[PDB]
Amino acid sequence: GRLHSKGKGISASAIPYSRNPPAWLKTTPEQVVEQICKLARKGATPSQIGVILRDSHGIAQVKVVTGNKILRILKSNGLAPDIPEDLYFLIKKAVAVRKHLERNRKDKDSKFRLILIESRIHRLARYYKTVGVLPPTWKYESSTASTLVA
Amino acid sequence: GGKPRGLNAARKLRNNRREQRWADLQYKKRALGTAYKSSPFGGSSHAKGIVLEKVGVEAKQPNSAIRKCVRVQLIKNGKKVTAFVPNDGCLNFVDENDEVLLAGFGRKGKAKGDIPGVRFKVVKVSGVGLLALWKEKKEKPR
Amino acid sequence: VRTSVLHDALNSINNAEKMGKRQVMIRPSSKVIVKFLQVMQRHGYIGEFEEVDNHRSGKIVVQLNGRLNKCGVISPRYNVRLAELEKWVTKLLPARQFGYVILTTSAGIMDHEEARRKHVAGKIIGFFY
RNA sequence: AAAGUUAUCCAAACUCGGUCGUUUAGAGGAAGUAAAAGUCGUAACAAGGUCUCCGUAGGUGAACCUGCGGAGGGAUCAUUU
RNA sequence: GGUAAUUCCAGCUCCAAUAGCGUAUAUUAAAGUUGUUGAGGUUAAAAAGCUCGUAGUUGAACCUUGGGCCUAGCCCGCCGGUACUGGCUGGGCUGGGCCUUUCCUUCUGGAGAACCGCAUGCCGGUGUGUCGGGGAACCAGGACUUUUACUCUGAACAAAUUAGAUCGCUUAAAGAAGGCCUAUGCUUGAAUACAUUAGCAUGGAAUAAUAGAAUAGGACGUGUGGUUCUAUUUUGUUGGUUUCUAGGACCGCCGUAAUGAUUAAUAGGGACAGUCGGGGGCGUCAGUAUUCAAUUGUCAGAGGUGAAAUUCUUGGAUUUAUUGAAGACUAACAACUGCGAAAGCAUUCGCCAAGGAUGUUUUCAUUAAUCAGGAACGAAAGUUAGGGGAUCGAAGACGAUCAGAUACCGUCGUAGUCUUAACCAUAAACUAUGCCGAUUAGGGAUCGGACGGCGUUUAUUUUUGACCCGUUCGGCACCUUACGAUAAAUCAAAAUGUUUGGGCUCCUGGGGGAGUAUGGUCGCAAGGCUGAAACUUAAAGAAAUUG
RNA sequence: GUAUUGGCCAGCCGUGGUGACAACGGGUAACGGAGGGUUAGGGCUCGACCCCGGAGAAGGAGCCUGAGAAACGGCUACUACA
RNA sequence: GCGGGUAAACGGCGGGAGUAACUAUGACUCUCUUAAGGUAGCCAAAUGCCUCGUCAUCUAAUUAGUGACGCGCAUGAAUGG
RNA sequence: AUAAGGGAAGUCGGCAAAAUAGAUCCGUAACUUCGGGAAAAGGAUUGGCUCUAAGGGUUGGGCACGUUGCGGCGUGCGGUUAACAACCAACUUAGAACUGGUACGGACAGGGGGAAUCUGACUGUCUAAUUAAAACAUAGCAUU
Ligand SMILES: [Mg+2]
Ligand SMILES: [Mg+2]
Ligand SMILES: [Mg+2]
Ligand SMILES: [Mg+2]
Ligand SMILES: [Mg+2]
Ligand SMILES: [Mg+2]
Ligand SMILES: [Mg+2]
Ligand SMILES: [Mg+2]
Ligand SMILES: [Mg+2]
Ligand SMILES: [Mg+2]
Ligand SMILES: [Mg+2]
Ligand SMILES: [Mg+2]
Ligand SMILES: [Mg+2]
Ligand SMILES: [Mg+2]
Ligand SMILES: [Mg+2]
Ligand SMILES: [Mg+2]
Ligand SMILES: [Mg+2]
Ligand SMILES: [Mg+2]
Ligand SMILES: [Mg+2]
Ligand SMILES: [Mg+2]
Ligand SMILES: [Mg+2]
Ligand SMILES: [Mg+2]
Ligand SMILES: [Mg+2]
Ligand SMILES: [Mg+2]
Ligand SMILES: [Mg+2]
Ligand SMILES: [Mg+2]
Ligand SMILES: [Mg+2]
Ligand SMILES: [Mg+2]
Ligand SMILES: [Mg+2]
Ligand SMILES: [Mg+2]
Ligand SMILES: [Mg+2]
Ligand SMILES: [Mg+2]
Ligand SMILES: [Mg+2]
Ligand SMILES: [Mg+2]
Ligand SMILES: [Mg+2]
Ligand SMILES: [Mg+2]
Ligand SMILES: [Mg+2]
Ligand SMILES: [Mg+2]
Ligand SMILES: [Mg+2]
Ligand SMILES: [Mg+2]
Ligand SMILES: [Mg+2]
Ligand SMILES: [Mg+2]
Ligand SMILES: [Mg+2]
Ligand SMILES: [Mg+2]
Ligand SMILES: [Mg+2]
Ligand SMILES: [Mg+2]
Ligand SMILES: [Mg+2]
Ligand SMILES: [Mg+2]
Ligand SMILES: [Mg+2]
Ligand SMILES: [Mg+2]
Ligand SMILES: [Mg+2]
Ligand SMILES: [Mg+2]
Ligand SMILES: [Mg+2]
Ligand SMILES: [Mg+2]
Ligand SMILES: [Mg+2]
Ligand SMILES: [Mg+2]
Ligand SMILES: [Mg+2]
Ligand SMILES: [Mg+2]
Ligand SMILES: [Mg+2]
Ligand SMILES: [Mg+2]
Ligand SMILES: [Mg+2]
Ligand SMILES: [Mg+2]
């Protein structure tokens, strides 16, 4: 099912069979890219830049519209985040739980949750280290990790 | 069911078979060599001894008789054991200090029949042979 | 997780045939699977099969006509020389007259009888009779 | 050029101490198994006459009894505005 | 075997092997009772209380297929013939050449073919040669070519042994001998295959891994500049110097090119939206009841049991009403219903962090599955220090019953029962049923989310909320059925297993002795984890049937 | 120094080497192999012993001659027997 | 004076007869008796008269020493074990 | 103060005396409140003379101009001497050769040790002038 659970859900999204833009889109790939770079400089991460553009105006699939991947556009334009967003959010969540835990000494359940969260951080960090996005000497030290998020 | 089945898992299978193979009792007694240590015979088939006294042992509950066994002190290592004397009327022939020769019942260290706590039988007395003496094929030397 | 799509395909075929169906559906489709089906077809054990092409992996729908007893797969891919190949046919085939054992060799995957004719050996992947 | 002789080396052997392994004696204490026509009770098998069993703690000649929390392998697959 | 012994001691007769037969110990088959092929784990022996995680084992799909001609070899049928020949426009099968966008690296040297004409000579071909246009194939030498596993064929490797060919030692176990007319002679054999792990070569290129262009640090050019090193023979000989030429290393400018990134898994992680629950922590609010205390009225019994007594009572018991304090607990609603990894979780409200499922044309792109040792949590009871101490109540003290009653019944009653800070780590911790993945039959209920629809109800009312009908995803469960399984009870898994192989971990081998002795390790202790042997026994045990 | 290489040895200078893919240690009623016994296949068990290799001559050490010996039907010394 | 409570207050915590298929012992039973009849432990101990108690060990020889046995003249639980 | 051979046979009792003793390097048990026991037990070396090696301090670093009488400066601007040169200064540790009537902490100074029982937990205190102990006190515990 899942890495740390017993659920067996299958909720997901289905990609349409067609790989071509609809005839009513009438938007060039050259014009579309600047909205992505403007929003990235405004602060939005690649996760919800796609959903805001999708809901607000036009583009449903950036890959189908422009022929290139969304993260690849930011990286080629020098706007890629220093750390991946999924690890960034995992670190933020672990920090917030540790902060609650130190106030609530005998919350054994949150202690159990923290063990799972950190084990998931180590497993994901092993993949990033072995693929080369992060330097091989990077280590997750709990004491000062709170500065990385903010 | 539940064994490892991969193509590079020959070590796990060999280790498990070696470890679990000790649960067998025949092999456990073979590996530890209790016959060399605990068995009255030093892992041999026969043994020589000296008769000490004649003792009668009662049979078990359903039966009722006296089996007329005998006490023997082993020459090889000096411990004392009890052995059985078969057929009928043989007790007269075997005197005290008669240098008997022993064997097993074939139950491999366990009691035979209704006879309690006896694992050996007399084959020869004074080096003549009991059955041959019984059928008067020979005469016991003095 | 899914460790043998070939095992899934043959198990689904065996279940449907034993229960008497006429059509089968296979969710994952692969080149080794299709090459196996062609071997079955060349001996008449199955009928038409169709591979619908979604962009993920494609599917298979096979047409059955009875005439098939069982088709299984050996999961650990042993290494067999040419000289001991008759041990396997003695082991897991009801008789020598009929039945086939599927091998994989450097000349493609093939049955054990013409593979013997080609005087080649390799790895074992399954069987059917 | 023999006996003899000075200083190193290779070193058998003995004495004392330490440590490891095997076998074996021992007042007394406390168990197991078997053989009994022994003495005292009757715990379990029926709702065995206080339903049985598990973990824990205490008590009594003995099986055993009692408190707390579990299980049905139970003596109930079941009671309506 | 306890007085007519088919089983002891004897006589007859009969049975088995036979110059041999019995006994003891060891070892293999029997033993699918050690189980890779091939063994059990609901109740017969046996799934760790539960989760995380390292060694270890295992890991989704995807990159040159097909077609069109030619030809060699090998079988089968047929048509006849004579071992046996053509065939057949035969059918197969193996193999080798080209065109399809693909075909096959390169230079030097060797000898030399095929196709060409030159004149010289015979019966439209040839020697011809001291002819060159020309090198099919072959040989020798140099450079370049992702790397392993795997398989085919070779090489190298002991005599004896094993399998095995030949020869009538009079046959045979053996032996390597022998044979032929008549010979003052001739002739032959003394083979062959396997070993099998490691090492050395050759062909094949499926299956299973590995490397490559993303900050271009990428590929190519007889394009074009540089700066460094090396130096063959030619100018007599030697030494020094220079140019050209040849080679190597390294760095620019320009040009050439389709200039370089596989899907997005009913695998996984993350983000977002509206929700859901007796999931966790801290604080706070409420409820009757029990016991105690104060005030108040009346008068002889009250308690408790199958029946009594111990106990309290005009020093007013028991009972009635009002008020106060303290501690514990949250009835009815409450169910074949919910949440959590399990142990477990139920009065109101505020705060804090966490979670499942659904919805999604968001995001990353194999990040995954199970785990020896290792780690977190872990009912009740128990232990160490404070607070609290209503009710029940181990130990204890009395009253009955009984032959006895240290019990079952009744009145009291200490530790304990609650909480704060630390230990302990065991339960019938049970679904007695490990975890991930695929397929297999009908039904109707029900909890959460989403989608469609005819109506009713209702509000500062519409869209929303409540009820009704149908579909779908994910759960706790249930009824019928057997094509299936089991010894059976029974089971949608305990099925897809003698027609036996999807991945991983743990545990058991007749009953006792025994979860005992001893050693080690953790703990303040109680105890936890690991864990034998001597000896003894032919039965213990499971499911069902008649009594 | 040896017939020669080499932590074989003497001096100076570094701090390394092996291990859960089981090191190190304890048991062996253990000389190793070619091979014997038993069979559907897979295996289990034995191998002091006629062939090949290694070691020993009661237990330890030392050495001459000789191309070749740390030899024992060669010598020297100690222990135990005689 | 009458009626309750209190022992980490001062202190206390028993005799006699029978009884198991040799002998010995007495699990068991009757009986007198009151506030209760010494529980867990320990011992010829600095606490035992009989006593130089009995058995083992140490020595050629031990009224001494140590380890056990327990009807203990007259051991024993904050007069703390 | 010293004594041949024996070594507690003396005595209520090893009373008195003897034996061990510094420093450097090896080695170290049962038990345990894990802090100890421990200098446990038990071994080796130690002079004189001639040498070798190691452990430190101070002062010096390129050009390009302008004042002041070869120099102090004012500046601007480079390189890290593959660490060199001179001078100065006490002691502490390790190693080698030779040497002697085998001696060398040469006087002084300077722990005997082990296996067990009774009793008080420990450090501490008292009968000045016969008793220093098992006596008193102590932290801890409990009650009014
Ligand atoms: Mg997991
Ligand atoms: Mg799924
Ligand atoms: Mg002993
Ligand atoms: Mg004894
Ligand atoms: Mg009962
Ligand atoms: Mg029952
Ligand atoms: Mg008769
Ligand atoms: Mg008769
Ligand atoms: Mg079995
Ligand atoms: Mg049972
Ligand atoms: Mg069982
Ligand atoms: Mg695959
Ligand atoms: Mg022959
Ligand atoms: Mg997906
Ligand atoms: Mg009243
Ligand atoms: Mg209250
Ligand atoms: Mg509910
Ligand atoms: Mg309520
Ligand atoms: Mg584990
Ligand atoms: Mg608890
Ligand atoms: Mg408690
Ligand atoms: Mg206190
Ligand atoms: Mg308390
Ligand atoms: Mg009661
Ligand atoms: Mg009460
Ligand atoms: Mg358990
Ligand atoms: Mg269990
Ligand atoms: Mg479980
Ligand atoms: Mg609707
Ligand atoms: Mg039975
Ligand atoms: Mg039964
Ligand atoms: Mg290492
Ligand atoms: Mg040996
Ligand atoms: Mg041999
Ligand atoms: Mg020799
Ligand atoms: Mg010698
Ligand atoms: Mg000799
Ligand atoms: Mg010789
Ligand atoms: Mg008597
Ligand atoms: Mg007593
Ligand atoms: Mg006494
Ligand atoms: Mg005394
Ligand atoms: Mg004593
Ligand atoms: Mg004495
Ligand atoms: Mg004395
Ligand atoms: Mg007294
Ligand atoms: Mg007293
Ligand atoms: Mg006293
Ligand atoms: Mg003297
Ligand atoms: Mg003297
Ligand atoms: Mg002396
Ligand atoms: Mg005297
Ligand atoms: Mg004396
Ligand atoms: Mg003195
Ligand atoms: Mg010392
Ligand atoms: Mg000491
Ligand atoms: Mg010296
Ligand atoms: Mg000294
Ligand atoms: Mg003191
Ligand atoms: Mg005084
Ligand atoms: Mg004094
Ligand atoms: Mg005192």
Rounded Cα distance, A84 and A66, in Å? 23
Cβ-defined contacts of C113-121 (< 8 Å, 24+): C116/C82, C116/C85, C119/C82, C120/C82, C121/C80, C121/C81, C121/C82, C121/C85
Residue A90 corresponds to which tokens in the numbers above? 């995992």
Element (H, E) at A86: helix A85-103
Instruction: Flag whether residue C54 sits within 8 Å of chain A, measured between CB atoms.
Output: yes
- Are A93 and A117 in contact by the 8 Å Cβ rule? The answer is yes
Distance C129 CA to E91 C1' (A): 27
Rounded to whole angstroms, how far apart are CA atoms C44 and A115? 58
User: What are B123's two structure tokens?
Assistant: 């084959």
Is C77's CB within 8 Å of B6's CB?
Answer: no
How many CB atoms are located within 10 Å of the residue C101 CB?
A: 22
Residues whose beta carbon sits under 7 Å from strand D: B 37, 61, 116
Are B5 and C77 a contacting pair at CB < 8 A?
no
Question: From the CA of C35, how many Å to the C1' of E433?
Answer: 41
> Is C24 within 8 Å of C36 (Cβ atoms)?
no
Flag whether residue C55 sits within 8 Å of chain A, measured between CB atoms.
yes
What own/partner pairs with CB < 8 Å and gap ≥ 24 does A32-41 have?
A32/A58, A32/A59, A32/A62, A32/A65, A32/A66, A33/A66, A33/A73, A36/A62, A36/A70, A36/A73, A36/A74, A37/A73, A37/A74, A37/A77, A37/A79, A40/A74, A40/A77, A40/A79, A41/A79
Nucleic strand F near CB of residue B22 (< 7 Å): no
- SS3 readout for B74-126: ECCCCCEEEEECCCCCHHHCCCCCCCEEEEECCCCCCCCCCCCCCCEEEEEEC
Residue in chain A nearest C1 by alpha carbon: A1
Residues 6+ apart with CB under 8 A from B42: B35, B36, B76, B77
* A80: exposed, middle or buried (Cβ count in 10 Å: 0-12, 13-18, 19+): middle
The set of residues, in sequence order, having a beta carbon less than 8 Å from that of B61 and lying 6+ positions away, is: none
Nucleotides of F under 7 A from a protein CB: 21, 29, 41
Q: How was this structure determined?
A: cryo-EM
Q: How far is CA B19 from CA B5, B12, B16, B25, in A?
A: 18, 11, 5, 14
Q: Is residue C75 within 8 angstroms of chain B, CB to CB?
A: yes
For residue B21, how many C-alpha atoms fall within 13 Å in the half-sphere facing its CB?
9
- Residues A46/A86, Cβ–Cβ less than 8 Å: no
Residue A141: count other Cβ atoms within 10 Å of its Cβ. 7
Distance of CA C41 to the CA centre of its chain: 10
> Which long-range contacts link A76-81 to residues 24+ away (Cβ below 8 Å)?
A77/A37, A77/A40, A79/A37, A79/A40, A79/A41, A81/A45
Task: For chain C, list the contacting chains (3+ Cβ pairs, <8 Å).
Answer: A, B
Separation of B64 CA and F63 C1' (Å): 81
Strands B69-74 and B120-125: unpaired
CA dist., res. B37 & res. B12, Å (int): 34
* Phi (first) and psi of residue B42, to 5 degrees: -75, 50
Q: How far is CA A38 from CA A30, A49, C85, in A?
A: 14, 10, 68
